[PDB]
Every structure is written in structure tokens, then in C-alpha cells.
Design a protein around this motif. Structure first.
Motif: not given
Ligand SMILES: [Cl-]
Length: 98
Positions: A16-24
Motif C-alpha cells: 500500500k504505497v500510493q495515496g499515502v504521501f510516499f513520494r514526499k
Molecule cells: Cl503516496
């Protein structure tokens, strides 16, 4: 290689790695460690990019990508490929690619 030898490695994170502020969070951790490279969401629900820097910093980053991530992410798997030793850095910063 560890210590101060410079390395480059490609990565892809699953879970669960998208829509969770992973990139920031990834960019902030990379900058905190003095790394350059990039992070991007793929169309397959994953996160990918490359890291470049001193071996010891890259390894801490690899551990962070396998175990921690952003607070609400849940990393199920982290795959690393094309690890190589380099003499100079290709990138000058840690980008979030959109
Ligand atoms: Cl994310």
C-alpha cells in the motif's frame, strides 16, 4: 560496497504505497541522507526510482524503503536492481517525478 564508495541502485516498492504521501516522505529521507536520485508512481500501483550516493547512506535508504516508508504506507516488498559502483553522481538532486 559500503562506507564512502559511491553507488547507484534502481528500486521498486510494492504494497500500500500510493495515496499515502510516499513520494514526499521518500524525497525528504533521501535529502536528509544526502542522496540524489528520484521517485515516481507507476501505472501498476507501485513506486520506483533510483538512488545514488555513498554506499553507507544508500544502504540506510534501502532499509528505510523496505521497512519504514511514509507513516501510513504498508510495504510488502522492496526490489533492488542494477546496483553498480560509480565515480561521479549523475543527478544533482532528489526529484519527485510527475
Ligand atoms: Cl503516496
Amino acid at each position: 560496497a559500503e562506507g564512502d564508495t559511491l553507488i547507484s541502485v534502481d528500486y521498486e516498492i510494492f504494497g500500500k504505497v500510493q495515496g499515502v504521501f510516499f513520494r514526499k516522505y521518500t524525497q525528504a529521507e533521501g535529502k536528509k541522507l544526502g542522496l540524489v536520485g528520484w521517485v515516481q508512481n507507476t501505472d501498476q500501483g507501485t513506486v520506483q526510482g533510483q538512488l545514488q550516493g555513498p554506499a553507507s547512506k544508500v544502504r540506510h535508504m534501502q532499509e528505510w524503503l523496505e521497512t519504514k516508508g511514509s507513516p501510513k504506507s504498508h510495504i510488502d516488498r522492496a526490489s533492488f536492481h542494477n546496483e553498480k559502483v560509480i565515480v561521479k553522481l549523475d543527478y544533482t538532486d532528489f526529484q519527485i517525478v510527475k
